[PDB]
């Protein structure tokens, strides 16, 4: 296989856990599952098909063939319209978050987030000199009354809210999916205060129950009024590609794409976008997603099945409908450090819930994306044994 | 055969001139000269060599093999040391300028530039809410006394200076190269005021006399104190790749690389960086550069030689030692619009000097990078006919 690990080493990849550690920490894709061979063929085809145009400056919002297909995919998933002029290619959601935090917000502005949300996203906002304020959540995500109060309070305090940051589908870290009714209630609150929502949908294509799909995006439900949606190829084809996209209404997408950043450099990742375009065009992307989702489902079920047969009675686990993560809620007198100590005795790396915000009791995030079923089962056995 | 133009069309590439126009406007690489076949092999080689590691998140400051080689190349060119921990990979200088304008500057800060400088760079700074202030220049670039006055007056007014932006080698648009003595004088002024210099060196590798190398960078001459240097593969391999790098002192490179942007997304363009790394490793990059510099030299010499008649007619032209551009100065009584109207009658697109700042009399930028010598000669003939 071309998905070998001979160069999966510090200094090449972002992080490698210490030797001997079964790594359920990061939401990385298992190396054997990364579609190296598919992307090799994609670059081969794209460079032949697009020729010199693959190496020239790209069309500023992104090559139109990819724009067109991404809009059509959004519309099909939402059941609601999406025009190509609403789409703007990015070099990854991390870069898109940086762009929004510096172009749709100014230093000192506040970003409202759920009590638990993406830790490195918070770090982007903080490092862009934005203030963070958490909002109470339940098993369906941000609570509408709590958001209403936070926006009302912020106003009276003179705290300008730049945007509300939400990951509504296959939430990082809890795995939950916000249902339609909650989505509408949060949009109503945001509209009343006329505050922008930034909807980070990195896991949207990773529903693990076949023939089930997430509810329509916040952006589509709002008719793209005062919502920007961020999507990425990181969790479907490979994070190293540094390619994603952004959906907004035509006016805002157009405004962003006329920034000097885009006029100076063109499409934010042109050559790679054409490679990925060839995969969408041929159906190979969807064939890959079907196989990958089936691989993730098997890993989810192996990890859930082992933990459930083995966990203590006080630990609660809600099977996620998709994405990369399980969320364990111990609560009670259970101590996060004590649980992490058990993970260390087990030789397993997991992610501490406190990284993501405030938990009711103790919470732990475990990834099932990075290891095969048998190793996940072994990690659950070891964790269970240590924790008993 | 792979550097074809069958997809060199609106919606794929950034811009295409109107039909029938000989395009000496943009500093684009002639499509036939873009090394499509070379990059195809590079992606094939990188994905086979690096395997799954080419599609995972990359090492945050950039894969070490590329860092190490870029540091060594800087050291060789400067004749002065550069360590790999001083190098950060970027997704192009446009992105790097955005990052610096929003991380090392805040809205309302001033950027000092030469009276003539990169127009789309100015647009990045303005769209990031920075104020621009032009500083007088001569044939060697920014004047030190003028920079000192600009900084001293800014300090008097409490106008925070974010940085001084300079392109010292094969300047866009004039083509000049700042000599060593002027580089040191500017560094002395900036050091006394403790202001950062952002040194944009997009054309540094494009000296068109095979034995000649530019002077050492401002950054190296300063010992990387209070200078950040930006480099790109746009002008050497292809702008669509969206790949460049940044050189700074270890402390600043390290601080930038711990930003949430890099922790969240890893290397800013991982897969493409590995393809390009394989070209550096084999010598193929340098062999390409030798051939491409020879092609540019032929184009420069063709265009310059053909403009002989105009120069003897009062138009002034200083032949550039490198880069992509010629700069014509028409003098007094010549009007830029009149000259542009003649270009229109000639069916030739050129770049108005007013795009870049304040000219002494009329100035025009002509690119020799985008067309073969015969077409450049025909454009010169038509221009001279229209202007006579
Ligand atoms: C919610 C969320 N958004 C964004 C990202 C990263 O986005 P990208 O790889 O496209 O930069 C992650 C992966 N940790 C994530 O979990
Ligand atoms: C001075 C200068 N800097 C940067 C760029 C563009 O940089 P990049 O393609 O790496 O984004 C150009 C191209 N016009 C330039 O002339």
UniProtKB/TrEMBL annotation, chains A, B:
Protein's UniProt keywords contain Transferase: yes
The lineage's top-level taxon is: Bacteria
GO MF terms here are: 2-aminoadipate transaminase activity; pyridoxal phosphate binding
One Pfam entry for this protein is Aminotran_1_2
Which residues are in the Aminotransferase class I/classII large domain? Answer: 53-383
User: Which keywords annotate this record?
Assistant: Aminotransferase, Transferase
Q: What is this protein called?
A: PLP-dependent aminotransferase MppQ
